[PDB]
């Protein structure tokens, strides 16, 4: 497996010893916040650090494209005819204290999220599609009517009844049903308002993974040891230590071999890591998309609808396309990214092989000839005097709300401005400077939307069900440029239709959607990205493969 020029796996030529201690770190300039219950945990650092303990007790294995498969802690099966998901927990699925994982532990997850007394921030609208769950969430019902137990609460089976089936239900991260268990017998006497701060969900939890946390140092570290009651393969290692390391100390920590693996390192540090002897640097395709938006209307919050009613030359398809073809994204990436940013051809990242294709063509290749010709034939005629184009007497001038974030954000933005000058479009920064992130978010997400920018950039970390509805639908508040297009609406609906229960049909729907978005050019895909992980040469069985389900049990050391 490759990801760009990176290997996804470190094929160590040396055999693993029996035992050993692996030293892992996560790069963060903020402390971790330990919370072992998925529904109550809001810290991405700790979520990753919980991996050896079961990742906050996730149930389901997937393939390398995040589609559910059988063989994890539980299986899930969908029945269209009865509008039901059936979750079957393994017979020997146990908590780390030896107690059984049961149907009730799965239901209890729902309670931690849906009962406001626990204080979860993880309720979503998608959960309202489970029969009876809204009524539980608002306190109208004492129980969740759509969740039943064919073999009772202490059995191993749970059935979840939906109002409507959704084709994304075969993808992990879909949000229509949950994928974790919580130890009800361990936590049942803790007041809901005290659950998040209880020792029992922080320093002294029960877990289901191959390792259990023997010691948690608040904000800093976990000492993991083998979980005797793990259903699967006994781990090779005797222990794993997982610690937070600061950005400023990560490179030195590799130089001194303080950590075997550091996760979450940022793109800027890669050139300092590449050259380190003693490490193999692995790479993987990210669940990420960056894109350019054009401002085309406003958002009507009361009626939950985008209205594409802004006066702007960007209402012209030829203009939107030309501004995309003018950019030099590849050249930019080649200068600055160290192969960690690669030009996007479409809005769905290539890691989703079942939902996209490299055959889809967008704006990944600069084509200034085409950009110029598009503007010509649309009546935007160039000037002798000024280097800029005019139509019905008015100059083609646009405002670019570029933002802070990338290490060369200023330089990249200026480069694009200069490319746009080459096609006779005058582009200026919003208020003559890059926008701060929090300012940018406010500007883009406060209805009805501003009228004082034309072009902006956004970037998203996508869930493993890469839903486009909450980003680009006519009803979506995150449709930042506010386009509203009958063909795109059709395309979006088709992706989530009953016909898309068929994977080949769904792939075709995702592909059409991506083609149509590129042609219409309301938005322009910019970059995909790669993540990297340095790995000490003594580590055996390390891989970034998303389909690798047993890495914590398989991983070892050669000395």
């Amino acid at each position: 497996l490759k990801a760009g020029n990176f290997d996804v796996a470190y094929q160590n030529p040396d055999k693993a010893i029996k035992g050993g201690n692996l030293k892992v770190a996560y790069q963060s300039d903020s402390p971790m916040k330990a919370q072992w219950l998925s529904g109550l945990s809001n810290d991405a650092t700790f979520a990753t650090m919980s991996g050896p303990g079961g990742g906050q007790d996730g149930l389901f294995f997937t393939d390398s494209g995040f589609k559910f498969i059988k063989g994890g802690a539980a299986d899930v099966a969908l029945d269209k005819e009865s509008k039901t998901a059936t979750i079957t927990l393994r017979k020997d699925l146990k908590w780390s204290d030896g107690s059984e994982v049961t149907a009730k532990d799965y239901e209890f997850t729902y309670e931690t999220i849906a009962n406001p007394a626990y204080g979860s921030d993880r309720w979503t609208d998608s959960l309202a599609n489970i029969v009876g769950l809204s009524d539980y969430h608002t306190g109208k019902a004492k129980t969740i009517s759509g969740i039943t137990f064919p073999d009772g609460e202490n059995g191993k089976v749970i059935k979840v009844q939906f109002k409507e089936m959704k084709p994304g239900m075969t993808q992990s991260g879909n949000g229509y049903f949950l994928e974790t268990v919580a130890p009800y017998q361990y936590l049942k006497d803790v007041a809901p308002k005290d659950l998040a701060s209880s020792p029992k969900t922080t320093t002294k939890p029960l877990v289901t993974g191959p390792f259990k946390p023997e010691n948690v140092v608040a904000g800093e570290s976990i000492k993991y040891v083998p979980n005797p009651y793990y259903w699967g393969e006994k781990p090779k290692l005797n222990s794993i230590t997982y610690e937070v390391v600061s950005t400023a100390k990560s490179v030195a920590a590799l130089s001194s071999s303080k950590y075997d693996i550091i996760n979450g390192m940022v793109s800027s540090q890669y050139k300092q890591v590449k050259n380190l002897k003693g490490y193999k640097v692995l790479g993987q395709q990210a669940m990420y998309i960056s894109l350019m938006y054009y401002n085309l209307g406003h958002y009507d919050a009361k009626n939950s609808i985008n209205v594409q009613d802004r006066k702007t030359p960007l209402q012209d398809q030829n203009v939107r396309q030309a501004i995309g073809y003018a950019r030099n994204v590849a050249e930019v990436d080649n200068k600055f990214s160290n192969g960690l940013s690669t030009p996007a051809n479409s809005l769905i990242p290539p890691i989703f092989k079942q939902f996209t294709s490299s055959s889809v063509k967008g704006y990944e290749k600069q084509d200034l000839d085409k950009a110029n010709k598009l503007l010509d034939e649309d009546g935007w005629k160039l000037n002798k005097s000024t280097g800029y184009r005019e139509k019905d007497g008015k100059e083609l001038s646009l405002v670019y709300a570029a933002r802070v974030g990338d290490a060369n954000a200023e330089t990249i933005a200026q480069n694009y401005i200069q490319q746009w000058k080459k096609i006779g479009v005058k582009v200026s920064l919003y208020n003559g400077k890059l926008m701060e992130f929090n300012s940018w978010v406010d500007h883009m997400t406060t209805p009805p939307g501003a009228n004082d920018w034309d072009i902006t950039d956004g970037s998203w970390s996508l869930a493993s069900e890469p839903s486009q509805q909450d980003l680009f639908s006519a009803a979506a508040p995150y449709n930042f440029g506010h386009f509203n297009d009958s063909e795109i609406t059709k395309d979006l609906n088709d992706i989530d239709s009953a016909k898309s229960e068929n994977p080949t049909y769904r792939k075709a729907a995702f592909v059409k959607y991506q083609e149509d978005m590129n042609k219409k050019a309301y938005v322009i895909p910019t970059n995909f990205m790669l993540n990297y992980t340095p790995v000490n040469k003594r580590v055996v069985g390390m891989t970034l493969d998303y389909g690798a389900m047993n890495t914590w049990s398989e991983i070892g050391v050669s000395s």
Binding site: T124, D125, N174, G175, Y288, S459, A463, E465, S467
Partner: peptide, 6 residues
């Protein structure tokens, strides 16, 4: 609610 700024 699935995807995040980042």
């Amino acid at each position: 609610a699935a995807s995040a700024s980042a």
